[PDB]
Design an enzyme around this catalytic site. Structure first.
Site, PDB file in Angstrom:
ATOM      1  N   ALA A 141       0.824  -1.202   0.000  1.00 48.51           N
ATOM      2  CA  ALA A 141       0.000   0.000   0.000  1.00 48.51           C
ATOM      3  C   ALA A 141       0.862   1.258   0.000  1.00 48.51           C
ATOM      4  CB  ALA A 141      -0.913   0.021   1.227  1.00 48.51           C
ATOM      5  N   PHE A 143       1.242   5.634   0.568  1.00 48.52           N
ATOM      6  CA  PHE A 143       0.827   6.631   1.554  1.00 48.52           C
ATOM      7  C   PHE A 143      -0.278   7.552   1.048  1.00 48.52           C
ATOM      8  CE2 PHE A 143       4.120   8.591  -0.963  1.00 48.52           C
ATOM      9  CZ  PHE A 143       3.683   9.889  -1.136  1.00 48.52           C
ATOM     10  N   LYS A 167       0.427  -5.970   3.039  1.00 48.14           N
ATOM     11  CA  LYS A 167       1.562  -5.182   3.511  1.00 48.14           C
ATOM     12  C   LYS A 167       1.093  -3.738   3.644  1.00 48.14           C
ATOM     13  CE  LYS A 167       5.604  -2.839   3.440  1.00 48.14           C
ATOM     14  NZ  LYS A 167       5.722  -1.355   3.444  1.00 48.14           N
ATOM     15  N   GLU A 170       3.212   1.209   6.674  1.00 44.93           N
ATOM     16  CA  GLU A 170       3.726   1.243   8.039  1.00 44.93           C
ATOM     17  C   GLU A 170       3.387   2.554   8.737  1.00 44.93           C
ATOM     18  OE1 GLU A 170       5.249   1.455   5.336  1.00 44.93           O
ATOM     19  OE2 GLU A 170       6.456   3.286   5.393  1.00 44.93           O
ATOM     20  N   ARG A 171       3.209   3.633   7.975  1.00 40.02           N
ATOM     21  CA  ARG A 171       2.897   4.930   8.562  1.00 40.02           C
ATOM     22  C   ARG A 171       1.400   5.154   8.733  1.00 40.02           C
ATOM     23  NH1 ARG A 171       5.666   8.536   3.692  1.00 40.02           N
ATOM     24  NH2 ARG A 171       5.656   6.835   2.151  1.00 40.02           N
ATOM     25  N   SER A 220       4.474   5.447  -6.162  1.00 41.45           N
ATOM     26  CA  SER A 220       5.480   6.071  -7.007  1.00 41.45           C
ATOM     27  C   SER A 220       5.855   5.159  -8.169  1.00 41.45           C
ATOM     28  CB  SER A 220       6.724   6.406  -6.183  1.00 41.45           C
ATOM     29  OG  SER A 220       7.277   5.241  -5.597  1.00 41.45           O
ATOM     30  N   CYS A 275      -3.048   9.750  -5.717  1.00 38.23           N
ATOM     31  CA  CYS A 275      -2.470   9.280  -6.971  1.00 38.23           C
ATOM     32  C   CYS A 275      -3.198   9.866  -8.175  1.00 38.23           C
ATOM     33  CB  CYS A 275      -2.491   7.751  -7.019  1.00 38.23           C
ATOM     34  SG  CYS A 275      -4.125   7.011  -6.814  1.00 38.23           S
ATOM     35  N   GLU A 375       7.688  14.045  -9.632  1.00 33.84           N
ATOM     36  CA  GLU A 375       6.341  14.103  -9.080  1.00 33.84           C
ATOM     37  C   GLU A 375       6.381  14.819  -7.735  1.00 33.84           C
ATOM     38  OE1 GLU A 375       7.919  11.703 -10.250  1.00 33.84           O
ATOM     39  OE2 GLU A 375       6.801  10.846 -11.934  1.00 33.84           O
TER      40      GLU A 375
END
EC number: 1.2.1.27
Lengths: 463, 470
Positions: A141, A143, A167, A170-171, A220, A275, A375
């Site tokens: 995933a 952010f 997965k 983590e943030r 990204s 995105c 970007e």
């Protein structure tokens, strides 16, 4: 004293992680630590994979109707606990309550769509078209929409008959953990879903492990291409909607006020952390004169924490992103980019310690400048200038990648010409966001991906 | 004679090739030169690509109904020119008249199937999703496409490949085999006679250099290939590198399993017809078989049936298997048979020393049956591509299933048995998509190519969201 830890999910139980590496979850509104996410160890990931494998056969043997009812119960639970998900999002990612609720509603709609699928999963020349599942799947995933990533993969991956190893970001693990708790409460068999947290090392492990038949990723372009290559190297299915810049064309005949409002809402919405964010625009012809009013509309935005009312846009996920966007704007200015609005050094009263960044607008940008290549993924809108529609079309096509492109205009001929000559998967007319999420390379494509086909043919009349 | 050359087909004229490098086409039955195929140069390929690009817009903007009419007229001409194509195939590729007839028949059937993609090409739309907001999707062609066919099926594979790209609105650049281009030239002439706009189809001939060009050029959007595993993997990798979407059937390996509870005579006849069919030159050939239980004691009957095959030129009657594609192919097959023999595999049947009266100069190779084969032997690992059958001895169905699974590039197989539970076990355990039951070849039609999947491949979707509020 010590902030709470983020639990794993193995064998239908939120077991604790034994790893020593921990990342502090900093609240983007005040940079205050509010969580600790561990990095899944080799043994923990091996146990998760073993649980997924042991659950695969049972979950697959069940009929499509059982999985459909399970997913319906999960959707109902989500709808019941939508406010909890919204609060978790606004707390971790700092997104506004309204935007978080809209994101959860879009995810619920995706889940429902996954539920609306028919028996298609099943599919002297006696022939069959059994479409069996693949096996153990996984997903990474980004952010941007962390709370919604699992809502894209879990429904299809499960209803198709495959086990999933998520997965999460983590943030932003809280949203995915709450979604997994709701799923488990829905009555799904233990071990069907597993969750592990980690970093690039975890992505490498997932892509390397053979039991992983398929993997999905968004974010990204660098990480996307890296995961695609590392997966194709091991001979496993891979699909990823690479993030890309969207070009919003604006013709002078278009509705000036409405066009400017929608542009300011989409580009700077949620600090551009989407995105599908419309980070670029093209003012064709007399549209160039709209830069002052565009800057005024941008200024009109109300910057505030995601939990406070009237918050039009939230802060950045981490201060590293703030430093990155600041360096990008500095490089653009150095290269000769004429900036009109600067919100880098913004001091939101009551939340100065946060990663808030005010709206930013840049004009006179050229394709060769870094502003057009790198970007931003922030509250920055680079504006380009052209003389004719063909110039804008060519500029948009020159972009190495693109998920969505919008053209504001009232002439049907111009709109059709742009939509036909453009090489973007998704085209919007008078809409900065053609689709709330990237559909271009899921629905039908997702069904085809997460499943296979066996054309069992037999001529067995003689025996 | 001057060995008439195989002229190219660029635009609306069969322009002659100015290339300096030439390859001489030899008849496999007599190894006599019958034609010269050119090696297209950079300028010729550039001109062909320019013609394809110039023809693309007109062919795309044209109604799908006109393309369907063109394909109907092309299929009609094929129906008329069936015998000519069959004779050209029998001459160049060396197959039997019946083989070429069936080839063109399958090609015509696939053309007919593709002719009915009208409804499939239609898009979808949802009116008034939101106030004054609508949504609709447009299916559009990819652009310019390319095709690389193997030395086998010079008519069937193109007829399966290019008409889909045509109906989808794309322009196709067909790269025929270096060994059998005549059939492709005749098909292109017939298509041109169907009233198709000039420049829509272009054909260039050349060696690996042509494949490199086709894969490197950016204008090319999609590429299709069928043949060996090495070439397929190379083309797929090069396309992925340059961004070309590539669909290739590389798992040509095929295994046959025979249980003691099956029709002995019919199973043996089908195996002998499939393995040695057309000299076992086809990609999806059942050149490997796993004998379980009483199949070992039946193997003698398999050899007896194989002996009945009459090795004779395709042009003459009683031709069950024709000559090999090239003399180098015969040399390679003989070397592989000798290696298998040296490795301890008993040669229950030998055909290397076959001599067809009046055609000894050809590349004729009789039926060859190799037994006692093991996974560590070369005959099992290497693709033979000839009239050779490798037989591995196993004791239970699990052993045969494991042997089949050991070959990942083996997406094709069949099982002979009478119990439904055994068939289900074979279908489940075996990791193969095309699984046959009591059938020698499991639906020769290969896929990763055609049908609705072919339309999806040769087309793209554009989601259009328009809100004409005011």
């Amino acid at each position: 004293s010590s902030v709470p830890t983020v639990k794993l999910f193995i064998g239908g139980k939120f077991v604790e992680s034994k790893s020593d590496k921990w990342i502090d979850i900093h609240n983007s509104a005040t940079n205050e630590v509010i969580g600790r996410v561990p990095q899944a160890t080799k043994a923990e990931m091996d146990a998760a994979i073993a649980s997924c494998k042991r659950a695969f056969p049972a979950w697959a043997d069940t009929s499509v109707l059982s999985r459909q009812q399970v997913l319906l119960r999960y959707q109902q639970l989500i709808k019941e606990n939508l406010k909890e998900i919204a609060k978790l999002i606004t707390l971790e990612q700092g997104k506004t309550l309204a935007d978080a609720e809209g994101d959860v509603f879009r995810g619920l709609q995706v889940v429902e769509h996954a539920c609306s699928v028919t028996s298609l999963m099943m599919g002297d020349m006696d022939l069959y078209s059994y479409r069996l599942p693949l096996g153990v799947c996984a997903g990474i995933a980004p952010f941007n929409f962390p709370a919604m990533i699992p809502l894209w993969m879990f429904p299809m991956a499960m209803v198709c008959g495959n086990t999933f190893l998520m997965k999460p970001s983590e943030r932003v693990p809280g949203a995915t953990m709450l979604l997994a708790k709701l799923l488990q409460d829905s009555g799904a068999p233990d071990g069907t879903l597993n969750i592990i947290h980690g970093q690039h090392e975890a992505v490498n492990f997932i892509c390397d492990h053979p039991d992983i038949k398929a993997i999905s990723f968004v974010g990204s372009n660098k990480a996307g291409e890296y995961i695609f290559e590392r997966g194709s190297r091991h001979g496993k299915r891979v699909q990823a909607n690479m993030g890309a810049k969207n070009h919003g064309v604006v013709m002078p005949d278009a509705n000036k006020e409405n066009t400017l409002n929608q542009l300011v809402g989409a580009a700077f919405g949620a600090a551009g952390q989407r995105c599908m964010a419309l980070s670029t625009a093209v003012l064709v012809g007399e549209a160039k004169k709209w830069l002052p009013e565009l800057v005024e509309h941008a200024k009109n935005l109300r910057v505030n924490a995601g939990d406070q009312p009237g918050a039009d846009l939230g802060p950045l996920i981490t201060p590293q992103a703030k430093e990155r966007v600041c360096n990008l704007i500095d490089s653009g200015t150095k290269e000769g980019a004429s900036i009109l609005l600067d919100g880098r050094k913004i001091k939101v009263k009551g939340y100065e310690n946060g990663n808030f960044v005010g709206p930013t607008i840049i004009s006179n940008v050229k394709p060769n400048m870094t502003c057009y290549k790198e970007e931003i993924f922030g509250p920055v809108l680079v504006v380009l200038e052209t003389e004719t529609l063909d110039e804008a079309i060519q500029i948009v096509n020159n972009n190495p990648y693109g998920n969505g492109t919008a053209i504001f205009t009232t002439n049907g001929a111009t709109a059709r010409k742009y939509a036909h000559l453009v090489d973007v998967g998704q085209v919007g007319v008078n809409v900065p966001i053609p689709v709330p999420l990237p559909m271009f390379s899921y629905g039908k494509q997702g069904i085809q991906f997460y499943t296979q086909l066996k054309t069992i043919t037999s001529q067995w009349k003689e025996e």
